[PDB]
């Protein structure tokens, strides 16, 4: 039996296991970003919950989670849902899962109709990385105003958010600017794990689109990682399927990508 | 007077300290530290020395002047200049934010201002409050930022990007605390810390569910949170919008004082 989920303090035990057998490190932002904001639903054998998933507003499950030991069960209760069988949870277009989530991706496999790819997952790897160095140095509060203008300018974020987003990262000493004579060159994000996943920092970078093409990028991830290590943490990184020049930029700061999310559509 | 566009507000940090130092009272924490530092900066120069500043946000109204003290005659000349919409630089300005207890910027206001309304009301607390049944509120942890975002959303109609953000940040603070029956909130409350020039107090906010007006829910709210702000050794403060008429009456009921106002000032 499946329910809607109050209060997400019902699912620290099943949200910690979840986590737990990712095989590596999910992206920061599709799991602790975007899936909390999801709604949740219990799945409940006899009056205990043995599992959960979360379906976003556009209709996309982001999480699924059953107690490993509910197998043949698990694959009827996920095609019921897929198939749209579930009065209470109604119509599910489809699913984000990465290959790291190995049975939530299973039963996608055996349900989904077509699929694209959305985004790589990275890690980085100490002998992939002579290249020139940058300094970047770490956001104060009084620079906030410049960092927003500049995302906005390039990236075409919302001020208003930005300020709010940017804010909390100059807070948590994750934001860093490569300043130039004066003026932005580029802002780095260097990402701490609250939960789950504190041993690894995920990775952000903007580049001023008047200085594309100058190996900016890289640099940036090379600092972004050092600063990581630094504090014992392992760098990870995302990024869009269709952003060649961070993908480039990334694997020039010695990441590899063996993991993508995947999007699918259910038959 | 040269006026100057300032990028890095890094060359304001002397001029933004005596600007608060000066004021009556603490300033409003969303209009000092969430509006003004977004808002376009203006510098006075001197022969080539920094005496001054403003700010205009995106409107074209003033939130923030100050010239050091000893420019007097020079600082109405520059005030009309900039008022009266000659300044090359800061162009087309409308009018301009200020409250009672900012002296020396309001009094350039009247001066040069052809209309006025009140915006809102700030608080102060005076120890002479209520024996009296006191509510528990449990500070919001991480797991039920979602069901304050939606709280939020739902009674006031801001966006839910921006409270996930705004919110994420209080709850990191340990500011959020909610009122909560039968699995639901009842009401949220804010006890902000300001990180600096205002270090000794707390500025409070409260939502109560438009489910659950005229209970006395604010009141509590609001003294509960004061009390969490003595606790910390802080003075507590609040503010309000002056059409809020049950805001100022709980307010008030929460043994809440206000000397103060800020009010929109329209430029002739
Ligand atoms: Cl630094
Ligand atoms: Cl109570
Ligand atoms: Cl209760």
């Excluded at 999801?38 to 976003?56: D, E, R």
């Excluded at 208003?160 to 000493?173: C, D, F, S, V």
């Excluded at 001023?208 to 190996?215: I, K, T």
Aim: glycine residues 6%.
């Amino acid at each position: 039996k499946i329910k809607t989920i109050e209060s997400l303090s019902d699912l620290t035990q099943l949200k910690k296991a979840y986590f737990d057998s990712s095989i590596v490190p999910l992206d920061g932002m599709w799991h602790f970003g975007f899936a909390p904001m999801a709604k949740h639903f219990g799945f409940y054998v006899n009056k205990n919950l043995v599992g959960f998933c979360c379906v976003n507003d556009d209709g996309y499950l982001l999480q699924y989670y059953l107690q490993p030991e509910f197998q043949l069960c698990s694959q009827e209760l996920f095609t019921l849902i897929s198939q749209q069988n579930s009065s209470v949870i109604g119509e599910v277009k489809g699913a984000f899962v990465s290959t790291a989530e190995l049975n939530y991706q299973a039963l996608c496999l055996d349900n989904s109709a077509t699929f694209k790819v959305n985004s790589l997952m990275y890690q980085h790897n100490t002998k992939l990385a002579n290249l020139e160095m940058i300094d970047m140095q770490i956001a104060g509060t009084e620079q906030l105003t410049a960092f927003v203008t500049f995302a906005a300018a390039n990236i075409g974020a919302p001020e208003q958010w930005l300020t709010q987003y940017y804010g909390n990262l100059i807070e948590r000493k994750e934001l860093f600017g490569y300043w130039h004579k004066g003026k932005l060159l580029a802002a780095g994000e260097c990402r701490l794990f609250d939960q789950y996943q504190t041993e690894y920092a995920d990775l952000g970078m903007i580049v001023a689109q008047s200085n594309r093409g100058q190996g900016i990028a890289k640099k940036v991830l090379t600092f972004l990682t050092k600063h990581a290590a630094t504090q014992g943490l392992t760098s990870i990184c995302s990024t869009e399927s269709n952003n060649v020049a961070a993908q480039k930029a990334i694997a020039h700061a010695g990441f590899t990508s063996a993991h993508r999310i995947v999007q699918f559509e259910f038959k």
